[PDB]
C-alpha cells in the first residue's frame, strides 16, 4: 500500500532543489540539499516495516542527520539569501554548522533545532538589510526580490513548519509528504538567481 512508500518517496522533492542550486552555481548549498535528500530518504526507509530491510546504518545516525541536514539546509538557504563577503560568509556558514550540530545532539526532537537557526539567520539578515536601507534611503532588496524570493520562500517556510508542528498530529502519511514538498520549495525560492561570488 502507498502509505508505506510515500514518506520515503516524497524525500525526492529535494532533487529539484539540488538540480536548481547546482545550475545557479550554488555548489556548497547543492551538497547540503543532496546530503539531506539522502539522509531524509534513508531515515524514512528504515521506519516503514515493508522496506526497513534495505537501510544499512543504525536508526540513531540516519535520524540525527535527517534532522541536522534539514536544519542546516534552512541555514545555508538563509545565508545564501543574505549574500556576505568572504570573511563573514565563511564565518556565518561555520556558525550554523557548529550551532546546529550541538543543538541536534542536545535535544534532537525539540523545535529549538529550527528556532535557533531561523531566529539567528533572521537577526543577521534583518540587521544587514536595515543597515543597507539606512545607507541607500530605500527598500534595499528590490520589490521584485521581496515579491518573487523572500515572500514566496517564507510563505512555503511557514506552510512547511505548520505542516510539521501542527497538522502532523491529524495525519503523518500525506502531511509529512506535503512537508518534504513545501520545504524543498523554500530552499529553491530563498536562493538568489545567481551565485554572485562564483564570478
Amino acid at each position: 500500500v502507498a502509505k508505506l512508500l510515500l514518506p520515503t518517496l516524497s524525500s525526492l522533492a529535494f532533487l529539484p532543489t539540488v538540480s536548481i542550486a547546482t545550475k545557479r552555481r550554488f555548489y556548497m548549498e547543492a551538497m547540503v540539499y543532496l546530503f539531506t535528500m539522502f539522509f531524509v530518504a534513508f531515515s524514512h526507509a528504515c521506519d516503514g516495516p515493508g522496506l526497513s530491510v534495505l537501510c544499512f546504518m543504525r536508526r540513531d545516525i540516519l535520524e540525527y542527520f535527517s534532522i541536522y541536514g534539514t536544519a542546516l539546509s534552512m541555514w545555508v538557504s538563509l545565508m545564501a539569501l543574505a549574500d556576505f563577503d568572504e570573511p563573514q560568509r565563511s564565518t556565518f556558514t561555520m556558525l550554523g554548522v557548529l550551532t546546529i550540530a550541538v543543538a541536534t545532539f542536545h535535544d534532537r526532537w525539540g523545535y529549538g533545532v529550527y528556532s535557533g537557526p531561523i531566529g539567528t539567520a533572521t537577526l543577521i539578515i534583518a540587521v544587514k538589510w536595515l543597515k543597507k536601507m539606512k545607507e541607500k534611503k530605500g527598500l534595499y532588496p528590490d520589490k521584485s526580490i521581496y515579491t518573487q524570493q523572500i515572500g514566496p520562500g517564507l510563505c512555503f517556510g511557514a506552510l512547511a513548519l505548520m505542516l510539521r508542528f501542527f497538522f502532523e498530529e491529524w495525519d503523518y502519511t500525506y502531511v509529512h509528504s506535503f512537508y518534504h514538498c513545501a520545504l524543498a520549495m523554500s530552499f529553491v525560492l530563498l536562493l538568489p538567481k545567481v551565485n554572485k561570488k562564483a564570478g
Partner: antibody
Amino acid sequence: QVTLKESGPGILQPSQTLSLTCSFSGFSLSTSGMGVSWIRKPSGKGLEWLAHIFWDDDKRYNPSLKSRLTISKDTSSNQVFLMITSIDTADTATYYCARRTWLLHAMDYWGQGTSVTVSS
Amino acid sequence: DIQMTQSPSSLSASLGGKVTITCKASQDINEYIAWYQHKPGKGPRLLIHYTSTLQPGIPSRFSGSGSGRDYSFSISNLEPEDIATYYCLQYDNLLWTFGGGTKLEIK
C-alpha cells in the same frame, strides 16, 4: 497626478550666484522616504546629476561642483531651492528637478526642465 | 563616481524593427540601472526602474537584461512614437551617474 516645475532667472551674467526653484504637487517632501533631486543637461553633453534633498533634511552634492551648490526645502509651499555660485559659460544648460521614492530609488517623475544661459 | 558608456551614441532603425542599446559600467553596480526616454522639449519618462522591471503604464515592447557591469535595453518592433534620446542611470551609489545617451532616429 504627480508634477514638478522648474523656475529661475534664465539669462544672467557670469561671475554671479543663480537661484533655481522646484515647485511640485501630487506628493509632499514631508512624506516618509521621499526625496527631490537636481540634474542638468549641459549644452550638447550627456545628463549630469547635481544634488539630492530628502524628507529627513539629509543632503548630497556632486563632488565635481560641491563647492558651489546649496540645496534647501519648504514643505509649506511644497518647493525645493538650489543655488549655483560663481556661474560660468560651462553652466549653459537645461536644469531639471525630479522626485525620488523609497520603494524604488531612481527618480520616476521629472519636471519639464528650464534653460539657463550665462553671457555678456 | 562610477562612469558608464552607452555603446551607440546614435542609432538609425526601421519603423517596426527591433533595436537594442548596450550600457557598460566601470564597476559592478548590482543591477541598480534605470532606463529613461528623453523625448525632446519634455521631461524624461522612466521606462525600466531595475535591470528589467518596467514602470507601470509602459508598452511591453520595452525590455532590459544583463547583470554586473554589462546591461542591455531593447525595443521589439518600434513605433514612430519611440523615436527619442535614451539614457541609462546608475543609481547603486547616491552619486547617480548617467550614460552619454543614445539618439535613436527613424530609417
